[PDB]
């Protein structure tokens, strides 16, 4: 399949080189996989999600996304126009309030929720979770991300937007999950992207067009935008039979474009997510 004039991030993920605008992907498109988006929630009714999005959990007075951030993330995972996995099921878990804040305790409960809740969903092809959130190092937060992963969910998490070493951030510093840095359209590290030996991969994170609340769209930036590219790519690869929750991060890093990014600090991986689709 070929989606012409795709958002640059989508084109990039299916390309060996920067500067192109068509997204190529196998038509299976993530069918029969599931992606949890753990964030401010998801405007499920957005036409772009086509009935494939559902809120399954909130810790606040409402499950609606009153912010937009989670909806944007969800659209990059799986909206028909802006998404990597155009046929995946999307499940929203609202651990962040409408100001995009959440206490660590709520975030942890949200991770544990998905680790059980995937047993209530139909995802023959596998399960992914996209966690575009972050705060200072906490072993409890790391440990919750590690449980989520060991239960059989491919966990992808934002490296953070501090332009600093991600070792100091959670769940970014958790070794067993996929920690995702942000790049821009000219293949430079995003200027806000964290870095470090704890990073596993980079995805498109600067000027990322996707869904927003009120049924609209917008371009925004962050390692939080890069994460759902990798989350969507895992779902897509898993439905193709290429990999599993337990090895998806590894496989993505093995099949990445390598040594193509600029401003990567000494000791951080120079790997850009890539679907290796032979159209
Ligand atoms: Ca990690």
């Amino acid at each position: 399949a070929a989606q012409t004039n795709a958002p640059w991030g989508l084109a990039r993920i299916s390309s060996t080189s920067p500067g192109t605008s068509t997204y190529y992907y196998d038509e299976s498109a993530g069918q029969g996989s599931c992606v949890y988006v753990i964030d401010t929630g998801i405007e499920a009714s957005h036409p772009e999600f086509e009935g494939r999005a559902q809120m399954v959990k909130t810790y606040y007075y409402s499950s609606r996304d009153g912010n937009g951030h989670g909806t944007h993330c969800a659209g990059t995972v799986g909206s028909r126009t802006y998404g990597v996995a155009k046929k995946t099921q999307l499940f929203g878990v609202k651990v962040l309030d409408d100001n995009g804040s959440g206490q660590y305790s709520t975030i942890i409960a949200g991770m544990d929720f998905v680790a059980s809740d995937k047993n209530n969903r139909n995802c023959p092809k596998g399960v992914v979770a996209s966690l575009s959130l972050g705060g200072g190092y906490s072993s409890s937060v790391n440990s919750a991300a590690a449980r989520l992963q060991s239960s059989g969910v491919m966990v992808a998490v934002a490296a953070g937007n501090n332009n600093a070493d991600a070792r100091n951030y959670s769940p970014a510093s958790e070794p067993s999950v996929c920690t995702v840095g942000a790049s821009d359209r000219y293949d430079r590290r995003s200027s806000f992207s964290n870095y470090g030996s704890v990073l596993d991969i980079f995805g498109p994170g600067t000027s990322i067009l996707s869904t927003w609340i009120g049924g609209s769209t917008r371009s925004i930036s962050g390692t939080s935008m890069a994460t759902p590219h990798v989350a969507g790519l895992a779902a897509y690869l898993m439905t193709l039979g290429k990999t599993t929750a337990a090895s998806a991060c590894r496989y993505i890093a093995d099949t990445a474009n390598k040594g193509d990014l600029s401003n990567i600090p000494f000791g951080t991986v120079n790997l850009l997510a890539y679907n290796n689709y032979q159209a």
Side-chain angles (χ1 to χ4, degrees), residues 172-179 198 200:
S173 55
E174 171 47 39
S176 65
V177 311
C178 215
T179 295
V198 78
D200 302 275

Side-chain angles (χ1 to χ4, degrees), residues 115 118 126-128 146-155 238 244-246:
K118 68 157 162 85
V127 184
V128 184
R147 294 194 292 278
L148 181 53
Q149 175 77 43
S150 66
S151 84
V153 172
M154 193 286 179
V155 184
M238 293 172 48
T244 63

Side-chain angles (χ1 to χ4, degrees), residues 135-153:
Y137 182 84
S138 154
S139 61
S140 279
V141 173
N142 280 14
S143 152
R147 294 194 292 278
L148 181 53
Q149 175 77 43
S150 66
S151 84
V153 172

